[PDB]
Amino acid sequence: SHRKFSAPRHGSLGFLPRKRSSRHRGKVKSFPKDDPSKPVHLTAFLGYKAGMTHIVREVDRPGSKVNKKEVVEAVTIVETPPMVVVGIVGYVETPRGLRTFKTVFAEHISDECKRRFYKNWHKSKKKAFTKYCKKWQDDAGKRQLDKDFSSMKKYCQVIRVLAHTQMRLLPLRQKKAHLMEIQVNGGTVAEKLDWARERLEQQVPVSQVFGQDEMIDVIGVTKGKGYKGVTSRWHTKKLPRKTHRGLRKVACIGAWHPARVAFSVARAGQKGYHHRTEINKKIYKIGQGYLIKDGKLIKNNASTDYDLSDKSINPLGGFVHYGEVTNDFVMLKGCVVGTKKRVLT
Amino acid sequence: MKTILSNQTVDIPENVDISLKGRTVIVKGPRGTLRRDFNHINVELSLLGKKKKRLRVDKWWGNRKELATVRTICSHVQNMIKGVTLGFRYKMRSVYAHFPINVVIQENGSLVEIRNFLGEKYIRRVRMRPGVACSVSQAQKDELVLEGNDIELVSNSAALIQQATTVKNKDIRKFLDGIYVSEKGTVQQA
Amino acid sequence: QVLVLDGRGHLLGRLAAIVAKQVLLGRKVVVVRCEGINISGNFYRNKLKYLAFLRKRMNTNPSRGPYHFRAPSRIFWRTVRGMLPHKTKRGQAALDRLKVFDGIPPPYDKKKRMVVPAALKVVRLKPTRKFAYLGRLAHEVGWKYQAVTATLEEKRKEKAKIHYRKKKQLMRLRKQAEKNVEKKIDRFTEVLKTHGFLV
Amino acid sequence: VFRRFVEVGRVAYVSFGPHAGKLVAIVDVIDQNRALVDGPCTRVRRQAMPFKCMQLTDFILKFPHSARQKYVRKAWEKADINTKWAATRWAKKIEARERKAKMTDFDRYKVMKAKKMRNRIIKNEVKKLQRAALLKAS
RNA sequence: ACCGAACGCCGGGUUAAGGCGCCCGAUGCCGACGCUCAUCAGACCCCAGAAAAGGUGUUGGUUGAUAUAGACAGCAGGACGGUGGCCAUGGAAGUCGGAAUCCGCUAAGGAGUGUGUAACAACUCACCUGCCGAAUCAACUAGCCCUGAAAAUGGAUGGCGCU
RNA sequence: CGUUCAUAGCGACGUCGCUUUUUGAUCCUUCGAUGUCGGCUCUUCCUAUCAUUGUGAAGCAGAAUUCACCAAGCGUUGGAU
RNA sequence: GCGAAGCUACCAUCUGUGGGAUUAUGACUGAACGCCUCUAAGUCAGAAUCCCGCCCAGGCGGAACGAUACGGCAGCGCCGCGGAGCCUCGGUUGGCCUCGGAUAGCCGGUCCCCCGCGGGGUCCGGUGCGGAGUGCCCUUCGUCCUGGGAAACGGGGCGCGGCCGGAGAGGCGGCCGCCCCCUCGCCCGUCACGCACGCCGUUCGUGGGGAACCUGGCGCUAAACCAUUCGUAGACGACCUGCU
Ligand SMILES: [Mg+2]
Ligand SMILES: [Mg+2]
Ligand SMILES: [Mg+2]
Ligand SMILES: [Mg+2]
Ligand SMILES: [Mg+2]
Ligand SMILES: [Mg+2]
Ligand SMILES: [Mg+2]
Ligand SMILES: [Mg+2]
Ligand SMILES: [Mg+2]
């Protein structure tokens, strides 16, 4: 028979195999569409969630009940020290898909970066790219390098740049800079690829990629919550006190006759640590890091035109379970997926 | 049953020249070219005569629905000729009981904004089928003129602005509002 | 030893039939430019008929289910596999001889590629009937790589034009060369036209 | 954009059937898809024959729509159809296709030798023509 | 449990009933004549599925008509007088209804098809012309197709598919 | 019937159907036992559509509204006995 | 009592998207049916539908790039050319390509005109049951001798160096220098080659695919796992990190 009293279903199927993510670092599953017209630039960057705080601001949406009223507002800080572009990488369009084509790397690559090409740096002789960077200091190679580029200049449709973080600069314990491909959307493929060739071994700071008051999309892996029961996982109803075998369950799995249980029925498994792609996180601020001229310029961070104190965003006694954010940072409105120290795309 | 042959003529006049590449009548003359492919109709377009004076459309072994194209092709060819020679001018008056229908072309005859229909804040921007050009009329007050060579493109573009101006959720017996097509004509009579 | 058929202008299940039977006799067959293949009956009709097939799926665990390929290559290969004994070893062995393609890629772009006339639209449909192009049908049903296939194939046809042009030039040279030479080859060429060539 | 038409007195080659390889001048069309046909000179009897089989020639001899065999015979022999047919490319390339089929295994060999050589004397001449066209381009 | 056919072990030949795109042995015949297109096509004893009633979808039949004495459609012109005709008054002068149901002028208009009126009025619907110019229309009937035609796990002309 | 008007909406006298969410018929299956009602929880499916999308209809002036289509995407609630 | 950290609540706070095909319907052109008609052939608008996008997962599915075991016994990667010796089998000339049309096509040549030796155009001339034809084309299938003709500078040495084109899954060609050697196709003369005595798996792709073994030349010099650690993780494994 039917269900007496309707209700919506618990959860959404459009997120599942509610499984422990395969990746740690959040993949950009789809970059935006390049056009022609507008200059080359990266489409994304890589950060580290330090923590959170309030912000106060005037708010100018006419019509509201909050118009030119101050509000408080949550933000995240994302420690986002400048990236280094190490490699480039061309993609060719095909009827199968989007085949990767021709990957150049720079002459020098930092150990920060080379770490990531080993499970175990302590043990490793550290021999990666040794026989490659030879190319960058002879005639024969340097000619092949040009042909390797000029091939991409003819064929490839999409060119992303490889970069890596500057793990060095973060308080975080790990030394293994995350690598990443980051897509260059801009002018023609040649122009694109020339821009990348200029950027090789070079810094790329946050401001170059994102601007203030700009909606971005955070991607990152959820805060992980081990195995969990159907109740905390799917937010199904707790059964009532009297319930002889368990009450944090789902009474009936399925009906009788399609006599399997379905994927659509709420079961118990991994809660959290999924891969997730949030969208529309505004950027309330992009802070310049610490630096010097004669003494420090710590002021410039948490300072405003209406505070003008000497504060850093670093709260008293450091960001908790993190450290001092000394570098430049983005201050998204709201929460972002995932936990302190997490690599946040 | 099958019918051993039906066929029909079209007197092309001396003002016009017509060709045909295969089954693809091309008509040019005063106002310009007008092509039309009839791949999809399965006929023998015999253009014949010195001075190329007439098109002729055969149809061998036609069953009822097959034969009926024969004429329709021919008819489309007249209307091609007509537009080349004369042009099409679809006049459409605006009709309203209260809110006057403010029209204003934009690019040339391409865009048509249509403000204050029924007092609606929403303005109906209506592009044309390319090849046509709307304009506003002088002499007659609430009245557009859609001039163009291709009958189809004109009429379609008319309809578009006929249909834009409909009323939702009210009784259209009563609420007789909009642009509607008053007269189908030509750009010059002869 | 290999059959390369230009899938273009065939009838989906008509060509499949021939291919199946060939493939089971041990002929390595390659079909190619499947998206050209065209299915009898009008489009809307067939889109609806694909949309049935997408409605089909195991309730409890769709993931196990009838695997609705969207790519017009696969779609052809599915309909051959419906005309094979594919659970057996011999049916799966056969199916490993069939090779199919979305458009026509490098090993067979430069191959004289056959046609089966018994599968051919221009032979088997009456000319007053409608028919889907598979390409369209795939497209609307979820296939991605239409444009990519198209835009590679423009680049194929341009390259082929050139090949053909240059062929034409050699053929013209041959014709001229025979006319230059004729008198010193007369008492061969004669014999080839007494035993039935050249005429 | 048609050229050959089923007329009274059009000559038809019979692609297949009993009387394949024979000419035949349509006397008269019985039906949508069937003609009453004759081949007086060609050794084919006054008989109905469907269109299915009779692919039709550029010739059309002239007699009346229901003739009496003598008169279509006369028409035939006047126009010398049988000569004219045999000097057509078509009938020549039938004969050609007949003569390759007749080829004895000895003749086959002979031919093979001949063409082996006859191709060689062209291929060199083609080479030259190519070499000379390259010199003009330079 | 139907249809064929009834069994020792085998070689060759032939059959029945059913078959012969491919799964699958056999049409890989230049097989023949039609009909038919379905945004729910159809596709073979038992059998596993539909009806009444519709359809200018098409294809056949049957019977009547029409008509150069000038048609058929298409637009154009008139549609009256005896007459508020009789019954009915609640008002029916053609027009809620009902018995009537003829004559004049007629070229021709019904004691009137509707629309509308308290009731009229007004509008509307034959006979003939002009442009026009040869064929055209009605009623039945039956074949395929469609409408009629709604159920629950995803789904079954056996499947793929087939025009 | 609906001022009038058969068919906006209805529909007698008659008649043809579909459906198995009613109940009957029936007794094929199970009596070396298929846990016998509700409610609770959870999923999914159907459409014969209450609502929402886009639409045709009216005895639709607007407002409210019935009648019908495409349509099962999303919903369809808290309590007294 | 009050409570850091942590978990955690519409009991706090943040985020939640764009296309395409079209359905019903309304239409355009427009015949059938001299008029009329959304429909027949053709064209349009069109939606909580449908399919895709974003989003999640990622195939007994692929990719590009890195590093590739100095050694104390090592062991391998290329290159070219040799000897045996298991195993796995199929095969038993090639075809190196226009696009497409079908109530139409194919090729020439432009005298003439436009565009970037080509492309497009018109005009003319040829074919068209297709001979510039897959009914096709290419290729030959015994070996050698010498001693004439027709044909003749062609072929080779896994001959050697340069310049190209090819990215869809390139995997293949092409064109240019120099060294040495030869006289091959077509007709004939002129002999000879175990002629194994009528009789089967012959004839090739083939130096085939895989595995173990003997030679030269030039190159190489590891990561992974465990243990240890971490807590962005965790039932256990797994994961994320650290360690001259
Ligand atoms: Mg319910
Ligand atoms: Mg208990
Ligand atoms: Mg009444
Ligand atoms: Mg049980
Ligand atoms: Mg319904
Ligand atoms: Mg209303
Ligand atoms: Mg749309
Ligand atoms: Mg419609
Ligand atoms: Mg549309």
From Swiss-Prot, chain A:
Keyword Acetylation belongs to the record: yes
Chief location category: nucleus
Cross-link Glycyl lysine isopeptide (Lys-Gly) (interchain with G-Cter in SUMO2) mapped to chain: 38, 223, 225, 285
InterPro entries to which the protein is assigned, alphabetical: L3_arc_euk, Ribosomal_L3_dom_3_arc_sf, Ribosomal_uL3, Ribosomal_uL3_CS, Transl_B-barrel_sf
This protein's record includes keyword Signal: no
Bridged cysteine pairs (disulfide): none
GO cellular component: cytosolic large ribosomal subunit; nucleolus
Residue positions where Phosphoserine is found in the record: 12, 303
Post-translational modification: Constitutively monomethylated at His-244 by METTL18. Methylation at His-244 regulates translation elongation by slowing ribosome traversal on tyrosine codons: slower elongation provides enough time for proper folding of synthesized proteins and prevents cellular aggregation of tyrosine-rich proteins. It is not required for incorporation of RPL3 into ribosomes.
Key words, A-Z: Acetylation, Cytoplasm, Isopeptide bond, Methylation, Nucleus, Phosphoprotein, Ribonucleoprotein, Ribosomal protein, Ubl conjugation
Modified residues (Tele-methylhistidine): 244
Subcellular location: Nucleus, Nucleolus; Cytoplasm
Residues with the N6-acetyllysine modification: 135, 285, 293
SUPFAM superfamilies xrefs: Translation proteins
Domain of life: Eukaryota
Pfam families documented for this protein: Ribosomal_L3
Family, as annotated: Belongs to the universal ribosomal protein uL3 family.
Subunit field text: Component of the large ribosomal subunit. Interacts with DHX33.
Protein name as annotated: Large ribosomal subunit protein uL3
Organism from which the protein derives: Oryctolagus cuniculus
Name of the gene this protein is made from: RPL3
Curated annotation (Swiss-Prot), chain B:
Subcellular location(s) per record: Cytoplasm
InterPro entries: Ribosomal_uL6-like, Ribosomal_uL6-like_a/b-dom_sf, Ribosomal_uL6_a/b-dom, Ribosomal_uL6_CS2
GO molecular function, one term: rRNA binding
Top-rank taxon: Eukaryota
Modification N6-acetyllysine occurs at: 121
Main localization, broad class: cytoplasm
Transmembrane residue ranges: none
GO biological process, one term: cytoplasmic translation
Gene Ontology CC terms: cytosolic large ribosomal subunit
Family membership noted in the UniProt record: Belongs to the universal ribosomal protein uL6 family.
Task of the protein: Component of the large ribosomal subunit. The ribosome is a large ribonucleoprotein complex responsible for the synthesis of proteins in the cell.
The protein's assembly and partners: Component of the large ribosomal subunit.
Protein name listed in UniProt: Large ribosomal subunit protein uL6
Organism, scientific name: Oryctolagus cuniculus
UniProtKB/Swiss-Prot annotation, chain D:
PTM annotation (N6-succinyllysine): residues: 84
Main location: cytoplasm
GO aspect biological process, one term: ribosomal large subunit biogenesis
Keyword Cell wall biogenesis/degradation attributed: no
Example of a GO cellular component annotation carried by this entry: cytosolic large ribosomal subunit
Compartments, as annotated in UniProt: Cytoplasm
N6-acetyllysine sites (modified residues): 78, 84
Disulfide bridge map: none
Cross-link (Glycyl lysine isopeptide (Lys-Gly) (interchain with G-Cter in SUMO2)): 123
Keyword vocabulary terms for this entry: Acetylation, Cytoplasm, Isopeptide bond, Phosphoprotein, Repeat, Ribonucleoprotein, Ribosomal protein, Ubl conjugation
GO molecular function: RNA binding; structural constituent of ribosome
Modified residues (Phosphoserine): 138
Functional note: Component of the large ribosomal subunit. The ribosome is a large ribonucleoprotein complex responsible for the synthesis of proteins in the cell.
Assembly behavior: Component of the large ribosomal subunit.
Similarity section: Belongs to the eukaryotic ribosomal protein eL14 family.
Protein name: Large ribosomal subunit protein eL14
Organism: Oryctolagus cuniculus (Rabbit)
Residues represented out of the complete protein: 2 to 139 of 218
